Motif scaffolding. Structure first.
Motif, PDB file in Angstrom:
ATOM      1  N   UNK A 236       0.856  -1.206   0.000  1.00 30.46           N
ATOM      2  CA  UNK A 236       0.000   0.000   0.000  1.00 30.46           C
ATOM      3  C   UNK A 236       0.882   1.243   0.000  1.00 30.46           C
ATOM      4  N   UNK A 237       0.529   2.210  -0.835  1.00 31.79           N
ATOM      5  CA  UNK A 237       1.366   3.432  -0.952  1.00 31.79           C
ATOM      6  C   UNK A 237       0.684   4.555  -0.177  1.00 31.79           C
ATOM      7  N   UNK A 238       1.449   5.240   0.662  1.00 29.82           N
ATOM      8  CA  UNK A 238       0.903   6.335   1.477  1.00 29.82           C
ATOM      9  C   UNK A 238       1.930   7.442   1.587  1.00 29.82           C
ATOM     10  N   UNK A 239       1.620   8.508   2.312  1.00 27.90           N
ATOM     11  CA  UNK A 239       2.546   9.665   2.391  1.00 27.90           C
ATOM     12  C   UNK A 239       3.761   9.361   3.278  1.00 27.90           C
ATOM     13  N   UNK A 240       3.739   8.249   4.008  1.00 25.89           N
ATOM     14  CA  UNK A 240       4.860   7.888   4.892  1.00 25.89           C
ATOM     15  C   UNK A 240       5.697   6.743   4.354  1.00 25.89           C
ATOM     16  N   UNK A 241       5.510   6.382   3.089  1.00 29.12           N
ATOM     17  CA  UNK A 241       6.281   5.276   2.465  1.00 29.12           C
ATOM     18  C   UNK A 241       7.122   5.813   1.301  1.00 29.12           C
ATOM     19  N   UNK A 242       6.901   7.055   0.877  1.00 30.66           N
ATOM     20  CA  UNK A 242       7.562   7.569  -0.345  1.00 30.66           C
ATOM     21  C   UNK A 242       9.053   7.825  -0.168  1.00 30.66           C
ATOM     22  N   UNK A 243       9.797   7.668  -1.258  1.00 30.69           N
ATOM     23  CA  UNK A 243      11.258   7.888  -1.242  1.00 30.69           C
ATOM     24  C   UNK A 243      11.671   8.218  -2.681  1.00 30.69           C
ATOM     25  N   UNK A 244      12.619   9.126  -2.864  1.00 27.82           N
ATOM     26  CA  UNK A 244      13.092   9.495  -4.222  1.00 27.82           C
ATOM     27  C   UNK A 244      14.055   8.428  -4.749  1.00 27.82           C
ATOM     28  N   UNK A 245      14.444   8.537  -6.012  1.00 29.17           N
ATOM     29  CA  UNK A 245      15.399   7.567  -6.594  1.00 29.17           C
ATOM     30  C   UNK A 245      16.753   7.693  -5.903  1.00 29.17           C
ATOM     31  N   UNK A 246      17.522   6.598  -5.757  1.00 31.84           N
ATOM     32  CA  UNK A 246      18.855   6.703  -5.185  1.00 31.84           C
ATOM     33  C   UNK A 246      19.770   7.536  -6.093  1.00 31.84           C
ATOM     34  N   UNK A 247      20.368   8.582  -5.523  1.00 31.18           N
ATOM     35  CA  UNK A 247      21.243   9.472  -6.304  1.00 31.18           C
ATOM     36  C   UNK A 247      20.543  10.712  -6.827  1.00 31.18           C
ATOM     37  N   UNK A 248      19.228  10.820  -6.659  1.00 27.81           N
ATOM     38  CA  UNK A 248      18.487  12.028  -7.079  1.00 27.81           C
ATOM     39  C   UNK A 248      18.764  13.236  -6.183  1.00 27.81           C
ATOM     40  N   UNK A 249      18.847  13.014  -4.872  1.00 26.51           N
ATOM     41  CA  UNK A 249      19.030  14.148  -3.934  1.00 26.51           C
ATOM     42  C   UNK A 249      20.256  13.909  -3.066  1.00 26.51           C
ATOM     43  N   UNK A 250      20.931  14.990  -2.701  1.00 25.35           N
ATOM     44  CA  UNK A 250      22.148  14.893  -1.860  1.00 25.35           C
ATOM     45  C   UNK A 250      21.993  15.825  -0.662  1.00 25.35           C
TER      46      UNK A 250
END
Ligand SMILES: [Mg+2]
Ligand SMILES: [Mg+2]
Ligand SMILES: [Mg+2]
Ligand SMILES: [Mg+2]
Ligand SMILES: [Mg+2]
Ligand SMILES: [Mg+2]
Ligand SMILES: [Mg+2]
Length: 39
Positions: free
Chosen positions: A8-22
RNA sequence: AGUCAUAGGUAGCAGAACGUUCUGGAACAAUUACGCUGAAAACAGUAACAGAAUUGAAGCUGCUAACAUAAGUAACACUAAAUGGAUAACAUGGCCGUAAGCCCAAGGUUUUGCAUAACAAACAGUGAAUACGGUU
């Protein structure tokens, strides 16, 4: 009452791609830090 | 999961993480915590995933506050002088006496009076009636 499958996808499970943000380099934060004394 | 290879570092460059405050995902401390240790470090022992930062301090003759040191040290020496069991009314002695006396001005603005501790400032006190000074 704990329940819920792991797909199940919710606002507390999201994560960006590895290497997108530093992390920003905060200069002036100690000798062990990345740009510690002179920036 | 067994062999090898590498690992000194300033300026600089790169990579991985810890912690503080706040927010989103319904609510992660009402009735606390407290076996005293664990970890390579930052630390941990009251979530985790993401995000927003006035986000980390022995180091700027920095600023603010508190507390020490010098140290019970220096100082309590301009003068007339004190004594009697009292900063005494009494007694003795001394000092000024063109002042250290008396009357005002400027300025101050209640600093003025009362209790052999006390519970007292919360209470009192400045009178123009000599043609006093001013106001003109
Ligand atoms: Mg090295
Ligand atoms: Mg070597
Ligand atoms: Mg929340
Ligand atoms: Mg700051
Ligand atoms: Mg002494
Ligand atoms: Mg006497
Ligand atoms: Mg006067």
């Amino acid at each position: 009452q704990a329940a819920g499958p792991d797909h199940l996808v919710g606002l507390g499970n999201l994560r960006d791609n590895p290497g997108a943000t530093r992390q920003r380099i905060r200069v002036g934060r100690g000798d062990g830090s990345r740009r510690g004394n002179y920036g």
